[PDB]
Amino acid sequence: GIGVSTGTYDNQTTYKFLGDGWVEITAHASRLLHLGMPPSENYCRVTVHNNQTTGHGTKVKGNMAYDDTHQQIWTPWSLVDANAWGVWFQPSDWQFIQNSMESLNLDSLSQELFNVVVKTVTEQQGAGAIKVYNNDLTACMMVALDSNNILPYTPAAQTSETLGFYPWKPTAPAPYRYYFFMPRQLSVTSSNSAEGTQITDTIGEPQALNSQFFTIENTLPITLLRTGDEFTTGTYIFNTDPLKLTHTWQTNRHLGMPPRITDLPTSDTATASLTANGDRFGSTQTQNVNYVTEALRTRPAQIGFMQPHDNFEANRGGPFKVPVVPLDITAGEDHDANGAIRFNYGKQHGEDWAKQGAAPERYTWDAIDSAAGRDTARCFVQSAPISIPPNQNQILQREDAIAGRTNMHYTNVFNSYGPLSAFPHPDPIYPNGQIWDKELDLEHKPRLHVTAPFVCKNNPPGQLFVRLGPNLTDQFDPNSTTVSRIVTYSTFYWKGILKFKAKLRPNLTWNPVYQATTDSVANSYMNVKKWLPSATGNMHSDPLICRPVPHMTY
Amino acid sequence: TGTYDNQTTYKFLGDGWVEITAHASRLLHLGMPPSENYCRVTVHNNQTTGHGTKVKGNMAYDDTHQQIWTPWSLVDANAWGVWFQPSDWQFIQNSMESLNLDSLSQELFNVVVKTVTEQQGAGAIKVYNNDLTACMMVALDSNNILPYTPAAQTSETLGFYPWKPTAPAPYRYYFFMPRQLSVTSSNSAEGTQITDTIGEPQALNSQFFTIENTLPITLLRTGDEFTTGTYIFNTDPLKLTHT
Amino acid sequence: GQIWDKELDLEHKPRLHVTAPFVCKNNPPGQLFVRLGPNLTDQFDPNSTTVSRIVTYSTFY
Amino acid sequence: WKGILKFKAKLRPNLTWNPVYQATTDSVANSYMNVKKWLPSATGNMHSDPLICRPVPHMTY
Amino acid sequence: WQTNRHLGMPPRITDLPTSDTATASLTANGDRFGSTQTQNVNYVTEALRTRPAQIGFMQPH
Amino acid sequence: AGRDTARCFVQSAPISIPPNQNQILQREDAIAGRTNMHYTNVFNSYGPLSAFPHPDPIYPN
Amino acid sequence: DNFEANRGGPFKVPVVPLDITAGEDHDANGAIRFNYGKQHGEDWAKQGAAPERYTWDAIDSA
Amino acid sequence: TGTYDNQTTYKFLGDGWVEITAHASRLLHLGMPPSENYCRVTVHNNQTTGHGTKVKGNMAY
DNA sequence: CTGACTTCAA
DNA sequence: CTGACTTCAA
DNA sequence: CTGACTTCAA
Ligand SMILES: [Cl-]
Ligand SMILES: [Cl-]
Ligand SMILES: [Mg+2]
Ligand SMILES: [Mg+2]
Ligand SMILES: [Mg+2]
Ligand SMILES: [Mg+2]
Ligand code: NA
Ligand code: NA
Ligand code: NA
Ligand code: NA
């Protein structure tokens, strides 16, 4: 029937305390969604090629990093993506979880579409002309669920296109599009390259060996929803690894038995002494010196490691910045060397509704981790047999230039990843961060993904697609390319239920622990005012810290 | 989806006990909120003239406070006039010695949603049509998480006339905001400074709640209805006699 | 006059309330809230603050 | 001397939108909540200052 | 065949190509949503975008 | 998963776009003054994020 | 001899113990040199504060 | 004749209830009493100077 | 009424 | 289909 | 009378 609702709206976050410290967290999320007609009903093979010889074109010397050229299959379908922390938790929920829990893991997911409404638009009068909206009671909306994951995975969180983060504000799905293989090659140059230097900037034709054109219609069963219909996905069970809600601080210099002091400090302002390093017990892996020091001591393994930056590698697909594992930026504040992430988002995902201009909000996330990062400027390599102190020919440091390039140092191309490397898992970023991810279908997989905390061990939740069915008008001739449609749009509710499994943290230190808190200090990053509505209701939800409590590594 | 009933029935148990059942029904009107946002609004009547708190001795005129204005409305029937005819009150007061609350239940039905459009131009008239698929949202704070706001105190409960339409009251609640006002009389010195301040939100006392994040919400289309179920009161009997 | 009231959630409570004859000993009847759901129009862009809605109202018993 | 004192407590609910006030430690010099105050000194001197309680607010009515 | 440049949601074009020989445009990289691991620049580009992992790698030779 | 070594390059950080010759290391740059030796000959970008296919089965040899 | 740096200061990155080879590259192949006292191997007769020192080269030859 | 224990344990019952068991242990020192008698002692600070109760307005002392 | 690229976590 | 600040007067 | 940071490899 047309006069009865097909679902219930619910946004509540409930905490079921099992006992033994286990907690079942059930995050209910509901949104009103708006869906319009596609600008085209065709699947299009679109190309973007920013090869201008001015501005930010790839045809100007040294502009490789500006490359945007690629090819995509544009589809008339839309994607309903809720894979972002902000969709499921209120800021206070995140705080409660981060301050009191030690671990968190994905449990299950289910989604539902209901209370579908389809309307048509018509013109009124002439002077004026106003628009009139009517119900198309017999019109329908199409829904498809890629449960087998046949179609390319496209996490909307990476382009800030997931559903909004405000339960009381309408949202919309994102238009679905996916990459298509297209040969692409770009020459490398610097702003100092010769004047008559030719920049090779090419794009090729489709290749038989790598072409994959998929349509929703030929691969997924499609459900038609009229105003009285509803759609449910059923429950999906996640298979992922638990995420630690704690952060580590022990570096290589903090592993094991500290050297024994000779005597306790003589006063509260005094320092202590060790026994002369020439008479000290211990071990090192520098056999040319007869002493041990904290810097030379052998430690079990290597916490963290040096990563090349800003490394750009090249493929048939063009140049690309190689991702880096997110680690502590250190006191040296080496953002790029330690993979700090800078994201740009809009008003549905955190930006102040009052902010003006086309520019999005920007935020740089630095790893909570304090023990695995690298302070590149203070790093160095000495020749062996080691000499202490070394002369300039026996040491390679930040001041030394590679291939005579003033700003290029051994650390830019240095990679110390090895069998002894140990490091933490990337932080979960509230509320902009992605939550789960699909694993790459390659025989040899990565140990982690930089973009999300939970990579699905098994098949991930399939994507949910929607679109309006064509609304034809009396004039229709298949043999012509003339397109005559009735202006239509729809709205419907979406409800998702995401369940987590968490565990309350133990408490054993003497000193109080660090906790995410709010405050009343003017201009403070944690001022309550930031999480309250303004006089006219404007909101903004800034990134919140996570993993505030430290845990012992060894 | 429901039946209209306003009758007040008296079930005489015997032994002098009486079960009084007050049925009340009203047609309600609900419009769109002037805003869909939750707003943190401030009122500060600190004018230096008239009834401002900036004029000597006007402390008692203070109206400054802060509130969370919401796009929701409250259906409040907690006032005697909603349940009894004047004669009922008279009968009870003249013949009874005690009265106590027993139970309560509420229901929303025969929902109707309409849209308004403009006609012609000279004139322009309004035309009203049924949105058969549109809905009205309903929420019941059975746990009492949200601030209690008895509409009787601002004369905003449902009307007292069964044959006249009424409307719910817009829901809004107090929010903590530092406020301080000096004391003076009309005879205070001329150059007397009146301290009249309001502060910023305080972390220690800020509580911003939304209906959407705390209560399950039901969507009612024209063919749906909503019932609360029966609630049992636990209160002390009221003496109908005076000393 | 008001008929029932919620008790103040303080450890030490008042012997009565001036505004109502019956203060609930236990949890009082929860409040009933209502509102119209937004009625969107063909033009809608979440990234803008432009608000385009269909003029709507309702009645119910 | 050994004593065993048992308590019964209940985890708090979480319903507000805005983050809540929490007792935390910090690294700001001369701050009342600087960690240094709850750590031993070079010679082992200790001191335990009063800590806040009831940081989270609840609605009275 | 998917390289790092082919992983995930492609950037959204502003409009569909105007003809079969035309190209499409993205929104100015200074106003584009997305993420990178180069915090010194306020824009996102296909080459700078953060991708899940690294497909393939450089080997000494 | 392959690498087009001549089109690979490394820039200094904070990144500068476009970079001048001292802010970029490319194929034209010589290591230890050896004309044909470039950073890519001794570069190894294998890491925790590396993903790649399995070698092909070669028929019939 | 790779020294990396952290909030904790500089430190020599450990190396996997492997054959030092005919070239006798101790540091490149993580040979371990330890210093110990009379309870753990040093000759009880030895005099001086200096501990006993020994460099262990991996049995591994491959 | 006993065991020393200072641990504070948290037994999470479920439903949010928690049984907190605080164990406390101390080494105590006990000396001889300065007297073995029960004494009826009097303190009377009625000096006419300093903080005595014999100086005007010193009642609170 | 999600299951690893179809049906078919039947 | 009202139950004391979630689920859960289950 | 060792069990992954409490109790609680109960
Ligand atoms: Cl940097
Ligand atoms: Cl050596
Ligand atoms: Mg299936
Ligand atoms: Mg299948
Ligand atoms: Mg309930
Ligand atoms: Mg409850
Ligand atoms: Na030592
Ligand atoms: Na850090
Ligand atoms: Na985009
Ligand atoms: Na050997």
Q: How far is the CA of H19 from the C1' of J4 (A)?
A: 22
User: Taking every pair of C-alpha atoms in chain D, what is the biggest distance, in angstroms?
Assistant: 52
The Cα–Cα gap between D26 and D38 comes to 11
Q: Which two tokens stand for residue B181?
A: 């006002």
- The reply to whether the CB atom of residue A14 sits less than 7 A from any atom in nucleic acid chain J is yes
Enumerate the nucleotides of strand J whose atoms come under 7 Å of any protein CB.
1-10
User: How many CA within 13 A on the CB side of residue A280?
Assistant: 22
Tokens of A109: 């997911």
In Å, how far is E8's CA from the nearest CA of chain A? 4
Rg of chain C, C-alpha, whole Å: 21
Of the residues C4, C5, C9, the best mutation for testing chain D's interface (the one with the most D CB atoms within 10 Å of its CB) is C9
Nearest-angstrom CA–CA distance, A169 and A148 = 32
Distance A149 CA to ligand 4 centre (A): 9
If we measure between CA atoms, which residue out of C51, A519, H43 comes closest to residue B202? A519
Q: How far apart are the first and last CA of chain B?
A: 48
Residues 6+ apart with CB under 8 A from A398: A376, A377, A379, A380, A409, A411
Whether B218 sits inside 8 A of A5 (CB atoms) is yes
Rounded Cα gap, residues D59 and B146, in angstroms:
8
What's the CATH code, domain A1-554?
2.170.30.10
Would the CA dihedral through A198, A201, A205, A210 be positive or negative? positive
Residue A315 in contact with residue E6, Cβ under 8 Å? no
Q: How far is E47 from chain A (nearest CA, A)?
A: 4
Structure tokens that stand for H61 in this block: 């002392």
Q: A349 and A320 in contact (C-beta within 8 Å)?
A: no
d(CA A474, CA A459): 45
| Å separating the CA of residue H16 from the C1' of nucleotide K6 | 17
Q: What is the resolution of this structure in A?
A: 2.7
Instruction: Give the residue from A213, A209, A234 showing the smallest Cα distance to A223.
Output: A234
Q: Any alpha helices (H) in chain B, and if so which ranges?
A: 80-83, 86-95, 211-214
A461: left (phi over 0), alpha (psi -120 to 50) or beta: beta
Question: Could you tell me the residue ranges of all domains in chain A?
Answer: 1-554
Residues A44, A177: Cα–Cα separation, whole Å: 9
CA angle A284, A288, A289 (to 5 degrees): 65
Q: Position of tokens 């704070």?
A: B141
Q: What is the CA radius of gyration of chain A?
A: 29
Count of beta carbons in the 10 Å neighbourhood of residue D22: 19
Pairing of strands E54-55, C56-60: unpaired
D12 touches strand J (CB under 7 A): yes
Cis peptide before D55 (omega within 30 of 0): no
Contact A543, A350 (CB under 8 A): yes
- For residue A452 the two structure tokens come to 């999300």
Look at residue B33 and give its three-state secondary structure. coil
Residue–nucleotide distance: B101 CA to J9 C1' (Å): 19
Q: Are B236 and B108 in contact (CB under 8 A)?
A: no
* Residues B54, B194 contacting (CB under 8 angstroms): yes
Q: φ, ψ for residue G39 (rounded to 5)?
A: -80, -20
* Amino acid at the residue A325: V
Phi–psi pair at F12, nearest 5 degrees: -80, 165
Element (H, E) at A218: helix A216-219
What is the C-alpha to C-alpha distance for residues G51 and A279, in angstroms, rounded to an integer? 6
- In the three-class reduction of DSSP (H, G, I as helix; E, B as strand; rest coil), residue C4 is classed as strand
Q: Do D59 and C10 touch (CB under 8 A)?
A: no
